[PDB]
Amino acid sequence: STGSATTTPIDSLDDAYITPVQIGTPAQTLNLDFDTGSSDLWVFSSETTASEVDGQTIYTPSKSTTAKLLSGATWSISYGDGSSSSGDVYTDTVSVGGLTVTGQAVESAKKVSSSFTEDSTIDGLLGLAFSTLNTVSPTQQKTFFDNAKASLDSPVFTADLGYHAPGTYNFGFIDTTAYTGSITYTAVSTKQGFWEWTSTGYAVGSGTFKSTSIDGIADTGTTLLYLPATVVSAYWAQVSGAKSSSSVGGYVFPCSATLPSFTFGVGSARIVIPGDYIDFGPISTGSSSCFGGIQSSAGIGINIFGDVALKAAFVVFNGATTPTLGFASK
Numbered sequence: 001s002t003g004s005a006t007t008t009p010i011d012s013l014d015d016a017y018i019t020p021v022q023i024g025t026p027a028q029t030l031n032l033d034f035d036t037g038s039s040d041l042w043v044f045s046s047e048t049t050a051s052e053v054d055g056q057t058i059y060t061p062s063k064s065t066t067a068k069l070l071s072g073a074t075w076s077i078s079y080g081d082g083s084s085s086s087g088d089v090y091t092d093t094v095s096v097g098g099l100t101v102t103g104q105a106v107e108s109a110k111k112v113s114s115s116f117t118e119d120s121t122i123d124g125l126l127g128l129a130f131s132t133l134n135t136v137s138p139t140q141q142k143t144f145f146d147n148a149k150a151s152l153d154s155p156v157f158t159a160d161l162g163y164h165a166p167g168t169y170n171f172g173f174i175d176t177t178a179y180t181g182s183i184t185y186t187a188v189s190t191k192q193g194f195w196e197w198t199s200t201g202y203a204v205g206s207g208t209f210k211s212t213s214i215d216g217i218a219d220t221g222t223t224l225l226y227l228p229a230t231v232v233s234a235y236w237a238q239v240s241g242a243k244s245s246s247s248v249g250g251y252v253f254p255c256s257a258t259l260p261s262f263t264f265g266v267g268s269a270r271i272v273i274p275g276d277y278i279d280f281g282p283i284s285t286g287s288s289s290c291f292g293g294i295q296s297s298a299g300i301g302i303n304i305f306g307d308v309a310l311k312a313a314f315v316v317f318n319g320a321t322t323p324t325l326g327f328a329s330k
């Protein structure tokens, strides 16, 4: 089997991408944020604290003839940004782009943090990291991909995120028309439950490439590119007037700037992020200070190749017995 679904930016800055997912019978379509940095499929629901719902579409398990309470199961997730959500668990039929999993754990939110409440366009998250991170207790549950994997034509999914445009998540096949040149594959460590890999270095604009190992995670659920402070300082030093602002919470730059590109290494290959991808616009409405799309990972504890990096590539998440990651230009 295979599945193919379009993923759409939630706003004009590509702050996140949402993908329609069918849950239950008859189908209830919710727009979920596919998150390769976590392993829970959780949704706004008829159980979510009313004051914490602000415009989201909700899953109502009582209206689904295939929903079953997973008795005694609860879940609770704390994301590294400080966001959180928790609740109880149903199993139900879940389909993405024509690919159907029966008996998928659907984690129904009773509580969500304010960040989720404020994101009216995000109806929940669909985790695509390794199932070892799933938070369901006392019986850990499998991700949608892990449940689908044996049935898929090939045990893979791909992320093809657009810059200021829709893109595609495919399951079970590699669309050879979706990228240019060849796909370069690189090793993955699953020791922390993430799609963790090591970039071979970086360049800023037309500058020379610096060969240096940068360990980090491929995370479709994170907006920006978070890298070591040394690398990030080298990037912003090429933008007149750029500075790190503790009051704003990262690097800002004059909105009048033309940003340089940023290149990252994948083995001997190179992925170029155009300068425009690194512009996140005014820090507040009408400001001439703009927020940067490359930020320091210092204090996060891990480097994060978020959407700013991933949207510059066609990315293969290879879930074979020994997982690997592939990157191609597009």
Ligand SMILES: Cc1cc(C)c(/C=N/NC(=O)[C@@H](N)Cc2c[nH]c3ccccc23)c(C)c1
Binding pocket: 016, 033, 035, 036, 037, 038, 079, 080, 081, 082, 083, 115, 116, 119, 122, 125, 219, 221, 222, 299, 300
């Ligand atoms: C200090 C710091 C700052 C950020 C932005 C992150 C990213 N975290 N990103 C994630 O955890 C995502 N994989 C999922 C996620 C967290 N909060 C969200 C809000 C909306 C949509 C997705 C997420 C971290 C780990 C630490």
